[PDB]
Each structure stands twice: as C-alpha cells, then as structure tokens.
Design a protein around this ligand. Structure first.
Ligand SMILES: [Mg+2]
Ligand SMILES: [Mg+2]
Ligand SMILES: [Mg+2]
Ligand SMILES: [Mg+2]
Ligand SMILES: [Mg+2]
Ligand SMILES: [Mg+2]
Ligand SMILES: [Mg+2]
Ligand SMILES: [Mg+2]
Ligand SMILES: [Mg+2]
Ligand SMILES: [Mg+2]
Ligand SMILES: [Mg+2]
Ligand SMILES: [Mg+2]
Ligand SMILES: [Mg+2]
Ligand SMILES: [Mg+2]
Ligand SMILES: [Mg+2]
Ligand SMILES: [Zn+2]
Lengths: 74, 81, 71, 103, 213, 135, 39
RNA sequence: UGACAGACUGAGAGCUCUUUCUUGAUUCUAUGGGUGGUGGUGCAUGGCCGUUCUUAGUUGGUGGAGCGAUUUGUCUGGUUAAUUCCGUUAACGAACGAGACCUCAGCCUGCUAACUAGCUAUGCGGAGCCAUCCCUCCGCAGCUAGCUUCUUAGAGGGACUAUGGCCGUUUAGGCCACGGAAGUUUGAGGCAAUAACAGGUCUGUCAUGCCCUUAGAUGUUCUGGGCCGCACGCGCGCUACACUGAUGUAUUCAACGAGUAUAUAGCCUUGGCCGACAGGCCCGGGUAAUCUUGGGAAAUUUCAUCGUGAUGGGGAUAGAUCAUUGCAAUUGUUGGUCUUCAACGAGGAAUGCCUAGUAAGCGCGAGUCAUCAGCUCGCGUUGACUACGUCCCUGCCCUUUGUACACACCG
C-alpha cells in the first residue's frame, strides 16, 4: 500500500526477505536463519535494512528542495 | 443631520437601560444589531454626545464602543424619568 | 565537527571532580549515573557529556590529568 | 438504563491535553465503567504561509505559521447522570469537551 | 454548528480582539493580558491589571459596562459572560505593564534618561534576570536615533526566547513625531511556576552535592 | 482465475468473448467520438467499444460501488493544453455510461442500492471461465 | 466588498479559515491568535 | 425636509426648474474648530522587513600599557562547521552570537490504546475447480482475539565518535573499520548578536509630525473608460524543436492539504440519469481518520499506428459555433467542437542553479477565487552524471604590512 511503482517493488523485496528471515528465526532455527541472513547480506544489505531516504522538503526561494530560481542582475 | 423624535427616543430608551452601545463601521446596513436605525444616526448622534462628552469613547478599530458617563445619565434623566 | 563546547567540558570535569568511585568506564552506566546525580534539559546533552566523561575515565585511569582534583 | 455515551475532546497543546485524557480515564476507572480510549486521532495541521515583508521589497522571504489541533475520543457505557458525576472534575485551560449521547 | 478548525481559529481571533480592544480602556491601569476559560453554562474572562478600584470604577460599575458591551458585541447568551479584573501577582516583570508605565512617564515630560532607568531599576529590583529598553525616534532632535539601554542577562536565539523573553512594543503620541518603545524582560527559573516559568533554560547544569554515608 | 491471468491477455480474451458470446445493442455514435476531451484522435482499433467494455468488466469485478464518475476519473489522462502546462483531465461520460448500460443489459453488472455498480454472480462465472481459458 | 477585520483594507487578505485579515495584520496579531511558528 | 407628473440628464439621482403638498425647530446662514484623504514628504518617523553577513562576530566591570584617541582580555601554535576547544598568556572573571534550544523526517514485531484505522480467524454466503468436502479470490457480520505488525498519536528508548586501528604535544581532535536505522552536529528548517543603510514601506493599519486639500472637495457614492494600450529593449517563466518520440488502446502507484446557514440542500461533491462534448436534472452524504478520497495523478509500463518528411514534432495565429461563472464577458473571463498548421533543425557574445532521494523529468493540493494559475507556496513519483577538491575567477573572516583614503578606491 502506498508509494509509487519501483518503491513498491523494492518494498516487496525487503518484505519477503525479512519475512523469510523472521519465519526461520522464530519457527525453524537461529542457525538455520543465519544462513539466510548471510546469503541475503552478502549480495546486498538493503534487503534487510530500511532505507532512511525521504524526499526532503522544498524551501522558498526556488522550485525544488535544493535549487533556486535563476538569478538576474541586469 | 436628520433624526426623528421617535428615532432619538428609541436611542434614549435604549441608552437609559444599557449605558453602553457599540456601532460598526460596516456602513449602509439600515439595521444596527439590537436597534433599528440606518447606522448613520448611531455613529453621529453619539459623535455629538462625545462632542458634548456625555459619553466617553474608545475607538477599538472601527468597532465603535461607547460607554456612557454619569454626566450623560443626568442628561437623559433630564429627558425621560 | 564534533568538538565539545564549554557547557559540556566544564560540566564533565566538574562532575568527575565529585563523583569518581561512583561512576565507571561504561558509557551507558555513566548515562544512568548522571541521571540520578545531575539535572539537565536534553537527552542529547546528557549523552554528549556522558560520552566525554567516559574517555575522561579512559585517560585518568592510566595516567595523571590536568586541574581536576580528587582526594 | 445503562446507555452508551461519546466524549470528544480537542485542544491546541499536547501536554495540556494528555493531562485531561489521564484525568477522565482514571475518573471512569475509579468507578468501574466500561470505557474504551483514549483513541488518538490524527493531528490537524492548520497552516498559513505569508510574505513576512509588509511592502514587498528585498529578497522574497516567507514564514510558515501553523496550529496543531489535536482530537481525542472516548466511549463510556454509563448513564448521562453518572457521566455528569465524573465530568464535574476540574478541566484544564484550553481543552474542549463535547459529550454527546450516541446509539 | 461549525467545524473544529474554524472554531479554534475563531476563538483565537476572538482572543485577539479582546486583548487588542481592552488596550484603549485599560491603558491607564496597566492592562497586562486576558485569559479566556471555558466553564459550564457560563463564560469566564480573567482580565489582569494593576488597579481594581480603577478598573472596576465605583462599586463595580465599569466592569459591568465592559462585560455588557462584550456581551452585546460578541452576541453571547445573556448572563453567559462576565469579567473579573484580578491583580497581577507581580508587576515588575510584565513587559506590557512596563510599556505603558514608561509611556506615561514619557508623556508626562520626564526626561528620557530618568524615565528609562526608572524602568530599568524597577524591573531589576523586581528580581528580573535581565532587561533592556530600546527607544527609537526623534527625541530632542530632528534626525531620528535609537537609545538602547541594557542590564543583566539576556537570550535572543533559539526556542527559550518564547519561554523567557517577555517583550512588548508600543507607540507614543508626543508632538513632532512618534517615539517607539521596545521592552524585553528575561525571566528567571521558578520551578513552582507562580512567578517564573517552570522549565529551566537549557544551558544550566546543577551537579547535586554528594551527601555522605 | 482472473487475478491469476495476465491483466492484458484477459482483456483481449474477454473482448473477443463479448463478441462471439452472443450480441447486444450498440449506439450509432461509436465510430465518431474521441472518448475523452483531451484525446486527439478516436481509437485506432475498430472494436475499441469492446476492449473498453472488457476493461470496465474487470473494474467492477475487482472493485465495488463504482459510479460513472469513478470511470470518468479512471479513464482520464494527461491533457496537453498547448503552451499551457499539462494537467489531469477526466474522460467522457457517455462512453462509460453505455458500456455500463450494455453490461447491465447482459446482466454482467448491475446498479446496487447505496449507489454504485456491482458484479452479479453469473457475470462472475463468465469472467472466471474466460480467465481460466487463457494460457 | 471584503476587508480586514483588523485594518479594513482591500488587499493582501487571508480568506482561508475565515480570518478576514490581511497578510500584514495577520502577522502583527499572529502569535496571540495562536499560530505558533514551529517552522 | 422628501416628493407625483413633464422637461434636463443613462438614470426608476425630485440635482435644477412649472406644481402646491408633506416633515417640523432635527435644520439653514455666518465665525472658529475638527473631521475625512491609496494627496506630498520613508530625507521628520514608529513598527515591520531586507541587506551588510550564513560568515563568526560583538560589548562591559576591575586590572596592565599609553599624555591621548585607543589597545590588552578577544592570543603564538594545534584543532573545529564556529571567538569550537586544547593550550599559551597582564590579565582575571564574565555578557551576548556559535553551540545548546524547538519543529518535521528517519529506527522501535518494546509500552498506551483505537468499530471515524487495519490486520488475523472463524461463520455463512458468491465464483473457479478429484465438485463432496478441500484449495484460490472476493462480499457481509459479530462476546473473535490471551490483536496492534501495517495506520494514527502519546510517552518514552536510541548516537555518544560509544567501540577498535592509525596520526596528533598522544591534549584538543582528525582519517579509517566492525556494529548499528542513523558515524558531513544523522538530514532539512525555525529562531538568531553589536553597529549600520538616509535600503523598502506615509499605498497594511482611527501609527503618525509638518505641509496641501476640506463642499464648486484630492473627502464618500454611482456610470463609462483606463491599469491589458504597441515600432521596440530587458527579466522570471511555459511549450517545444521529436523515434530515449508522438498518437491510440490495455495496465495501476502516492503524499501534502481543502470543504461559513453556503435557503429551502448549500461550500467539497459521491450515486443514478441526458448529452459526443461542454455541461444539465434527481436522490442525497460530510462542520469531517465518518462523505468526498481507503485521493483510481501523471511520468513511467505494455501492444499496435506513424518511419527522418518542418511528418502524425510544434501548437503560435485566425474563422465558425456551443455551455457554464457572473447583475454585467466588448479589447475574445473560462471550457468545449471542427477548421486555420506559423517560427522553431538544440540556439552567438555571454550567464544562472545544483553535491543525495539532491539536479532534472512528472503530476497533485493550497494561496489568489463568483470564474480566470503559465505564478508562488507546500506535497509526493521516477531518479542520476560529477566532486569529496582549490583560492584561479567573484566574494567572506582573521593576522601582518602600506596608505597623501574616512561620503573610506565608486577614495
Ligand atoms: Mg524604517
Ligand atoms: Mg582601564
Ligand atoms: Mg593611565
Ligand atoms: Mg580595559
Ligand atoms: Mg541543524
Ligand atoms: Mg530609510
Ligand atoms: Mg467607479
Ligand atoms: Mg500591471
Ligand atoms: Mg522570480
Ligand atoms: Mg501533435
Ligand atoms: Mg488555482
Ligand atoms: Mg502573482
Ligand atoms: Mg557567478
Ligand atoms: Mg581627509
Ligand atoms: Mg580609481
Ligand atoms: Zn489588515
């Protein structure tokens, strides 16, 4: 729910990865889930750790959160 | 100005009872809240009573609050009582 | 860009003056030590001063130290 | 005899508001009512953005003003006179309460 | 019936209207603020000022006048609202009170220096951690100038400004110009909250003494 | 079923299905309209009145209580105002109206009390069968 | 036909929430209305 | 004092006139004085705001030096985003600014709860089916939770360079590595010092001094026009110059917010119907996590159509006509429909903005608003190249030095 398109897909990725790890940890074995932990994290860390990036807000004096308006002297 | 004695009487009967009166700068209403008058007499007869300082006045940003004085109660008692 | 200001360092030295045997090396233990022995107005300043006092420990415990005086 | 009542309760300040929330919950639970709450309902953020200059000179500078209006709702199962037995305790400044009789 | 956003905005505006309007009436009494409290079947407005028998008048006639005019202007239910005019607990820390006090000392013709330090010494003897008075305008000369007078502690940036800085601005209607007054008072930490604000300024540490056993 | 079938091929299969599975009435303005104000040409396909209906079939399938305006909005798009900045523009009313009326006339969908359009059970049967008959 | 409640002028109004005050009067009285400026 | 009729004038302004009726001490006349002014003066000013100046800077008390303006403290050096700190020290001890502070965002399977939030299970229903049950997906309800992970919002917790290595007087710190959600104070803002400007604002203000005006008015109201005029020059922008595209189907994903008694349903408008559209009719819902909207946004994705052509790029211009807002649409308010199909081949000299969910692309909401959003402020969606530097250009801060400058090199 929510997001865009690629955001939702990467959220799928994270959700299924963490769901498999949590299911294994609580219902299989901690050493068993540790292999899943290492397979996932060796390829990438972003499967398991949320990404703290957000569209940071837009400030006055420009259209854009970091740019400004084109500036004229004469 | 033009005023009817009945207009000025419904002013005096109202002021004797209340002692305060508020106008509004919203002009051309023909019906002040709580009395019946075209809002020109409300502003300007109490302007006259301020000129005679029977009523002392605080302007309050086009809200025109007036509260009558013990001199003006004598003025109106000299009329109706 | 992490240099501690005087409100930090003065307080760290002053608290380490008085409370030595009652506070230790571990950062989190010093946090909770400082909770009962001082009143501050921000958890981040609390963490800041506790984290300065902890390496004040790690320097005192091995050699002598400047003005701060302990019986 | 035992009916269902709503109390809705809003404010501007969280620290003021939560004191009232704990107030009514304990007022009910001293007398063992069937309560559920205090449901916390998403904060309204009133906002007005204004050019802080009064004449329109100098670099364009805006300032963003905002109120935060906080909404709380609690359900009680008691008679309205039993409710008035509770809701005569002191009410903190600024908070508003709007008890209503529901289905 | 109205929405809550609108109700809260309207009550803010109503508060603004009283707090502004009462300035012409209670100027020569040290008006300092009003607080509007919501009470059952009744409406309460605590004006706070410096003279009860002058705000009340004689046998509470003037507060009758004002409560009636507020009644009638803001169309309350009759006997709904009435106003008590209670005394400020302390008068030397109310920036508004000082603003109109200096306004009267300065309309009276009192010299600028004597008046301004009359404000400063009074504020300090009233136990204020710090104060400044800024006067701007055409005093005794044509080209405008600012006389700034300071004393004691003072904070000006960050959040605790709203917490501690009691600041007012007023105009003076002396001939050949207008003379503006700014009065800033820094408050002291009274955790009881009766006089000074409860929460302390966030540049303070109080290491407690080591009680011994 | 239809949630298992690729969302495009189900539309194709059902578009052929409501061609060969009997027939109905059809307005005599279908080969004129643009189906939306921001469009520029009428649909390049001939049986667009049928692919449209196949799509709007599964809309009421997988969502309930949809009005005509909901379809106007769902079938709007980007309107290029010329030199103005482009915007979002809702689609046409009559085209969706006659799709819904046609499907109602076959009883696939029907107007619900409390408002909206909901599928019927035998329409559900039909959509599930045609979904199952796709690779 | 519409002005400030405060100054009664015809520009710079803030119609939103029904204030009926201009951008200047609004700031001048903003803090007592309650528009705490957290950011 | 108001007015019938007729002339006058748009005027259904009795303003004036022919006409005699009505009100009655309210007036009218004259002298003063005020009142009102988006009139002048921002070079008389208050306030507010901007800027100097986003940098780290500033001022006392006592003491030292100097006849004195003044200087020291406020620094040799190291370090830091920082007058940040270590330390040095005729200074000592302090006051602001920095930091600290507050707001938003990011972490919490930890706590408080939530039929105006949502899972989860079962109970039936509907449809697919080794159909008889099961299994998959939807619908509805509850004394279903020994439900709060998703949603909300409170209290809290969390980061401290804490841990390790190396450099550094092994001080201040820096660079690196594990861990961790977070190791440019974690990201972005709010607030923000002394001194100043003849910076802007007398057109925000019953804020204002002085002048001018004050009835035949620069006062107030109305009508019509004007602010939009166009040989032209400049500034911020929008649309493009296409194939990484346009067109036409199919596919489906947010966030920020918004919604006066608005009268006889009325601001957001769901739903049914008519219409190609535009937009109309009827039932209604919502003062709101309740109805709008669980925002069904676009870009993008997919399948075809156009195939290098000023073409189906482009939508400038102009004609015909239709409906809504409005008491009024003309110098077309706006929105449709058909047609008209311009320049524009990636833009000279020059110049601007930008270092991570950032630039850029894409849409939404709000402000204005009866209608008009190419603008401004917010919001999310997709999402990078480059660098992690230097004082070369433009500027800033400190120290030293030079000065015939002080309105200060525009000397
Ligand atoms: Mg100024
Ligand atoms: Mg000396
Ligand atoms: Mg000497
Ligand atoms: Mg000295
Ligand atoms: Mg910061
Ligand atoms: Mg100036
Ligand atoms: Mg006119
Ligand atoms: Mg113009
Ligand atoms: Mg611009
Ligand atoms: Mg085209
Ligand atoms: Mg708009
Ligand atoms: Mg504009
Ligand atoms: Mg440049
Ligand atoms: Mg010279
Ligand atoms: Mg030269
Ligand atoms: Zn205003």
């Amino acid at each position: 729910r929510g997001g865009g398109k690629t955001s939702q897909i990467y959220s799928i990725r994270q959700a299924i990865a963490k769901s498999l790890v949590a299911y294994y940890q609580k219902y299989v074995d901690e050493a068993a889930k540790k292999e899943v932990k290492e397979i996932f994290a060796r390829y990438d860390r972003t499967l398991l750790v949320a990404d703290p990036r957000r569209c940071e807000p837009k400030k006055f004096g420009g259209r854009g959160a970091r740019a400004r308006f084109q500036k004229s002297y004469r | 100005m033009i005023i009817s004695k009945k207009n000025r009487n419904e002013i005096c009967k109202y002021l004797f009872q209340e002692g305060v009166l508020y106008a509004k700068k919203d002009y051309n209403l023909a019906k002040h809240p709580q009395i019946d008058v075209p809002n020109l007499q409300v502003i300007k007869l109490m302007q006259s009573f301020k000129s005679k300082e029977y009523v002392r006045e605080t302007f309050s940003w086009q809200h025109y609050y007036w509260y009558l004085t013990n001199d003006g109660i004598e003025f109106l008692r000299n009329f109706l009582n | 860009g992490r240099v501690r200001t005087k409100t930090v360092k003065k307080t760290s030295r002053q608290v380490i003056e008085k409370y030595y045997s009652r506070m230790t090396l571990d950062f989190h233990t010093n946090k909770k030590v400082l909770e009962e022995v001082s009143i501050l107005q921000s958890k981040r300043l609390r963490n800041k001063v506790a984290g300065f006092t902890t390496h004040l420990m790690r320097r005192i415990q091995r050699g002598p130290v400047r003005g701060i005086s302990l019986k | 005899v035992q009916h269902r009542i709503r109390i809705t309760l809003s404010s501007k300040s969280v620290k003021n508001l939560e004191k009232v929330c704990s107030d009514l919950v304990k007022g009910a639970k001293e007398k063992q009512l069937k309560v559920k709450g205090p449901v916390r309902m998403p904060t309204k953020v009133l906002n007005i953005t204004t050019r802080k200059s009064p004449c329109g000179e100098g670099t364009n500078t805006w300032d963003r003003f905002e109120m935060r209006v906080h909404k709380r709702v609690i359900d009680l199962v008691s008679s309205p006179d039993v409710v008035k037995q509770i809701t005569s305790i002191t009410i903190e400044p600024g908070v508003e309460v709007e008890v209503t009789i529901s289905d | 019936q109205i929405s809550k956003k609108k109700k809260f905005v309207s009550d803010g505006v109503f508060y603004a209207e009283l707090n502004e309007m009462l300035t012409r009436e209670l100027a020569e009494d040290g008006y300092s603020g009003v607080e509007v409290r919501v009470t059952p079947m009744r409406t309460e407005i605590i004006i706070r000022a410096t003279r009860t028998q002058n705000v009340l008048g004689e046998k509470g006639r003037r507060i009758r006048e004002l409560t009636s005019v507020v009644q009638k202007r803001f169309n309350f239910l009759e006997n709904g609202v009435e106003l008590y005019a209670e005394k400020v607990v302390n008068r030397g820390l109310c920036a508004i009170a000082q603003a109109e006090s200096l306004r009267y000392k300065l309309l009276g013709g009192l010299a600028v220096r004597r008046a301004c330090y009359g404000v400063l010494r009074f504020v300090m003897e009233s136990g204020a951690k710090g104060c400044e008075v800024i006067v701007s305008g055409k005093l005794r000369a044509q080209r405008a100038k600012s006389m700034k007078f300071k004393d004691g502690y003072m904070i000006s940036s960050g959040q605790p400004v709203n917490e501690y800085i009691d600041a007012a601005v007023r105009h003076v209607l002396l001939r050949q110009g207008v003379l503006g007054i700014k009065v800033k008072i820094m408050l002291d930490w009274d955790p009881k909250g009766k006089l000074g604000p409860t929460t302390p300024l966030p540049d303070l540490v109080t290491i407690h003494p080591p009680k011994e056993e | 079923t239809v949630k298992d079938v690729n969302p495009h091929e189900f539309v194709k299969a059902y578009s052929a299905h409501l061609k060969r599975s009997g027939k109905m009435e059809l307005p005599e303005w279908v080969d004129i309209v643009k189906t939306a104000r921001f469009k520029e040409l009428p649909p390049s396909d001939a049986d667009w009145y049928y692919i449209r209906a196949a799509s709007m079939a599964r809309k009421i399938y997988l969502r309930q209580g949809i009005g005509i305006g909901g379809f106007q909005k769902i079938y709007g798009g980007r309107q290029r105002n010329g030199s103005r900045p482009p915007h979002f523009c809702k689609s046409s009313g009559a085209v969706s109206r006659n799709i819904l009326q046609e499907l109602q006339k076959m009883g696939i969908i029907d107007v619900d009390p409390k408002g909206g359009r909901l599928i019927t059970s035998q329409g559900r049967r039909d959509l599930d069968q045609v979904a199952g008959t796709v690779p | 036909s519409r002005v400030c409640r405060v100054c009664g002028n015809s520009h710079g109004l803030i119609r939103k929430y029904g204030l009926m005050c201009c951008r200047q009067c609004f700031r001048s009285n903003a803090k007592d209305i309650g528009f705490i400026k957290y950011r």
